[PDB]
Design a protein around this ligand. Structure first.
Ligand SMILES: Nc1ncnc2c1ncn2[C@@H]1O[C@H](COP(=O)(O)OP(=O)(O)O)[C@@H](O)[C@H]1O
Ligand SMILES: [Mg+2]
Length: 304
C-alpha cells in the first residue's frame, strides 16, 4: 500500500529561543494533523515537542522492523532542513536512542524470542553518500561503485558486510561508522535479515536513511529524489531512478518491493516558516506513493 508518512516537530532550540523566535506549529495528534500558523496537513501520525524517541519507535517505526523480520524489505528515511532533527531522530544518543539503535534492539529481542524452527543471519552495512560518491563508513573506503544484477538487485560493490549476533554488535558498527561521519551528505545503515524456517528461506532488507538537509553534483541525489517522488505520484511512464545514486539505492523503497515510512522533521520556529512549509508539502506529496511489497522467499542471493 501507500508509503507511511509522519511529521516530527522538535522543541525550539537555543538559537531560536535566544533570538526570540515564536513557535508557529500546532498539532492534533488524535487526528494526525499539523497546523502551521493556518495551513493544515494530515499525515499517518504527528509528533510534537513532547514526543520522545522511544514513543515514536513503538508507534511508528516498530511495524517496519517487524516487516523485515517477516521477510519484507523496509525503509525508514528522515527528511527535513538542517537542524530540524533528522539525526536526533535516527540516531539519538546513549541516554535516548534513536530509530537505528532502537531497531537493533528490537530486531534481536525478536530473534531471541524465536523458536527452534527459525534460524537467523543478520548482516550490517553502513554508507555515506556525498557528492555522488559512496563511502563505506565502517572501513572508511571511498568512491565505491554501484553495481546491479538480477540475483542481488542494486548494491555497492566493495561495501563491507558484517555478520552480527547481538544488538550490541550492531550498535558497535554504527558507533564506528559515526566516528568517521554532513549537512549535504546522506547516510544509510543497512540490515539484511535472513531467516531459515522449518526448509524455507526468507530475506528482508532494512534501510535506515538519514538524508541530506532539504533547505533552500552535491545535490543531485536530493534533486533526483524529489523528481522520482513526483513522477511516481503523477503516474509517469518512466521513473528516473537512474538519475542518482540515492534513487538507485532506494529504488525499491520508492514505488517498489518495500514497506516505506518517511519521517519529516521540522523546526517550530517562526524563522523557518518557508522551509517548514516546503518540508510539509513535500511530505504531503510523498504519502500518495503506493508500493508493492511482497515477502521475499527463497532468493537466489540468500547468504544463509
Ligand atoms: N526532538 C528533539 N528534542 C530535543 N532536541 C532535539 C530534537 N531534535 C533535534 N534536537 C537537537 O537539535 C540539534 C539538531 O538536530 P539534528 O537531528 O542533528 O538535526 P539534522 O536534521 O540536521 O540532523 C541537535 O543538537 C539535537 O540534540
Ligand atoms: Mg544530521
Amino acid at each position: 500500500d501507500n508509503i507511511k508518512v509522519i511529521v516530527r516537530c522538535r522543541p525550539l532550540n537555543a538559537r531560536e529561543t535566544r533570538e526570540n523566535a515564536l513557535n508557529i506549529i500546532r498539532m492534533d495528534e488524535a487526528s494526525a494533523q499539523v497546523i502551521v500558523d493556518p495551513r493544515t496537513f494530515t499525515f499517518d501520525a504527528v509528533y510534537d515537542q513532547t514526543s520522545c524517541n522511544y514513543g515514536i519507535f513503538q508507534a511508528s517505526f516498530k511495524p517496519l522492523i517487524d516487516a523485515v523480520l517477516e521477510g519484507f524489505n523496509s525503509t525508514i528515511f528522515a527528511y527535513g532542513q538542517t537542524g530540524a532533527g533528522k539525526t536526533w531522530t535516527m540516531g539519538g544518543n546513549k541516554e535516548e536512542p534513536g530509530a537505528i539503535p532502537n531497531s537493533f534492539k528490537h530486531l534481536f529481542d525478536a530473534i531471541n524470542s524465536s523458536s527452534s524452527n527459525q534460524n537467523f543471519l543478520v548482516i550490517g552495512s553502513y554508507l555515506e553518500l556525498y557528492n555522488e560518491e559512496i563511502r563505506d563508513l565502517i572501513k572508511n573506503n571511498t568512491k565505491l561503485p554501484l553495481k546491479e544484477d538480477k540475483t542481488r538487485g542494486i548494491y555497492v560493490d566493495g561495501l563491507s558486510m558484517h555478520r552480527v549476533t547481538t544488538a550490541a554488535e550492531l550498535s558497535a558498527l554504527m558507533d564506528k561508522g559515526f566516528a568517521n561521519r554532513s549537512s549535504r551528505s546522506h547516510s544509510i545503515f543497512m540490515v539484511r535479515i535472513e531467516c531459515s524456517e522449518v526448509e524455507v528461506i526468507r530475506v528482508g532488507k532494512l534501510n535506515l536513511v538519514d538524508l541530506a538537509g532539504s533547505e533552500r553534483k552535491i545535490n543531485l541525489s536530493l534533486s533526483a529524489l524529489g523528481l522520482v517522488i513526483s513522477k511516481l505520484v503523477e503516474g509517469a511512464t518512466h521513473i528516473p531512478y537512474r538519475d542518482s545514486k540515492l534513487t538507485r539505492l532506494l529504488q525499491d523503497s520508492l514505488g517498489g518491493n518495500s514497506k516505506t515510512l518517511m519521517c519529516a522533521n521540522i523546526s517550530p520556529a517562526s524563522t523557518n516558516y518557508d522551509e517548514t512549509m516546503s518540508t510539509l508539502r513535500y511530505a504531503d506529496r510523498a504519502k500518495q506513493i503506493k508500493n508493492k511489497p511482497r515477502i521475499n522467499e527463497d532468493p537466489k542471493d540468500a547468504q544463509i
